[PDB]
Amino acid sequence: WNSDSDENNVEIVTA
Amino acid sequence: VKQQIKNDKEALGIQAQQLLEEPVENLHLIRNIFEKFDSPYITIKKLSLLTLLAVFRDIIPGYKIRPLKEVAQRWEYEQTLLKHYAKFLQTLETILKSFTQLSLYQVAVRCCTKLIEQASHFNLSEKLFALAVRQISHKTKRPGFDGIINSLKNIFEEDNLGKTSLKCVTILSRMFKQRNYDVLPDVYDLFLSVNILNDMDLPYLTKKARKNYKETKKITQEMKEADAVITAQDKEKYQSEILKIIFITYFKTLQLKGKLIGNALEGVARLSHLLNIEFLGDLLQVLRELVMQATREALLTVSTAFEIASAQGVGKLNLDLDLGLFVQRLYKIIFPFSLNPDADLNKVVNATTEMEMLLKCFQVFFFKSKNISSSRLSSFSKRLAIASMQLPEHSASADLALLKKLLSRYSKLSRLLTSEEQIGDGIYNPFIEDPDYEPFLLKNHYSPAVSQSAKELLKS
Amino acid sequence: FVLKEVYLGMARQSDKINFLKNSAVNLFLLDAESCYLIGFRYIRQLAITLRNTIHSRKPVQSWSYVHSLDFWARLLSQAAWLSREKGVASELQSLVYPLVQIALGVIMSSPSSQLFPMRFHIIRSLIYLSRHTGVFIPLAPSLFEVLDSSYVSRKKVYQDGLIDQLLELLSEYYVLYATDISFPELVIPAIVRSKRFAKNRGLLTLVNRLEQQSKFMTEKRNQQKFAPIDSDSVEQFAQTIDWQQ
């Protein structure tokens, strides 16, 4: 009940 | 029995001694210590774990081992060393999660803290920190909690770069999401210990060696200058990310409106000066939006609002924001504080014992440069005397002492006074101006010394 | 020794109990200074029981303890009367303050509606002791909390009786503090709290009576415009105003 089991994303950094 | 335990302890001591003398050549002894730890005896398990902790801390390098005979065997040595260290940690979570046995768990916590204090920079620190914080995330204070928080606090203080602190802050934040931001008040105090935020003849050399020595010296000087600039930038970036994680946790705690609002306002007040100017103006909005222990919470909001406005140079940075709404909140909140009881027992802005903030908000209010004593302090002080009808005399003497040492020469505060505007609910007596009530009734009170306190006030 | 034995017998007994208490009081009045140690010892024993309860509360809230607290309050009131007659506060008279603190701590430790009658009895005893000694008592916060309690604030026969008892105690406290020059000022926080709680017939009547008393006190204070040096005029106005009702 305390498992740290914590995916794909994107980071908009360009104009 | 006892002879067998003594023999095993001697064997562990001999193996440990051989490791200290020749660590590289005796890696199999660590496996032997693990086999010795497998012995059913609890005391032998404790000694084997302690020897493993002592062995690991002695042989662990002071640098971070870069992953993949002079270089190859060293890599195999370091790769081999990492394998026992992983296995030793694997046993650590097994015994920690398995929670006579309490003593073993306390020892397990102890070696975990020792690894945290010493082997923080080493590999597998992410696992090491996660195991320790998992013990703290629980509702009740498990044994060794004081040791762990001290170790975490020490790392935050020593970590000038802030990379290790950033790792711990992220792990602590993850627990807060898991716990719905419901943890012990001591846990939030860890963020306050982040030092990053708080910072605000000669042997002969051949003709070839001299040119090598000169060439290396130039590199080191160039290395140092670039490292200093890179350290300044990385620390600045780490400080920004730490503020991002810390403030997002505090604001989430405020949204849930749990019992941890005390520590959240503590951190917000401490770290407000670190944040951007634009956020200062919007910081008081969240404080003033919680007005619909309710009196206690409103005391924190007004006190922290005073502290945020107390930041140096706000005159130059005319952000305004009209903290008068908090001023009237404090002006109205004194009556419910006088209504409800309070007990100091015996042996959150910055302290505890709610009466302490009130005088603390009053003294920072007094410390404000010419912001008061413009006939507004007297109106405030009148209800202060009215609220002084109860509470311990030392508290009563304290608030009366504030106006005693007050630089203002007004003397009608404890008697008929100018118009009591700003929510009223009191005798206005407009346009009176008479140097002529509460002390007369205060003389008759349970503790005899209140009488003489009233006498010393009228005589002074 | 005789007074201590009489007090021990009265405590063990607690008509006959009243006679024993009167005999102990008479023996206490015979040598107030000598009996001051006996009264202090009884107060210390009650404080020790309360301290043990805090560290339980049943011994403090027991019927025998309630009788012992009432007897101590009566002895303190008699000592206060003797202290006022002699012009100097006697040691037993000064011991009333520790008894009041003990009673307040017991009331706080037992705020249940079932134990509310014990709190009301303690409040009444404290009010009587305060009136006899002439020293004002901070029983307004306790009375306001009792009135605002869910049993009293929200409606049933026991709740109505408790509300009536609280109203009577509040009226007695207001009458006792009516003579004070700052009577309207000291009752302003209570009046505001009562008005907020109201915003039923008994509470409205009590609020109206308190407002009238505050208005009368304010008028008397306005008439008494003399400087603080002329405290005799304030005292004379205090004596003139009775408000025994």
XYZ file of C-alpha atoms in Angstrom, chain A residues 1-6, chain B residues 134 137-138 175 178-179:
12
model
C 0.000 0.000 0.000
C 3.081 2.190 -0.485
C 4.519 0.724 -3.694
C 6.457 3.170 -5.886
C 5.601 1.422 -9.157
C 5.229 4.818 -10.878
C 8.829 4.304 3.185
C 5.484 7.584 5.361
C 3.575 5.455 7.874
C 5.099 9.761 -0.559
C 0.672 8.349 -1.850
C -0.345 9.620 1.600
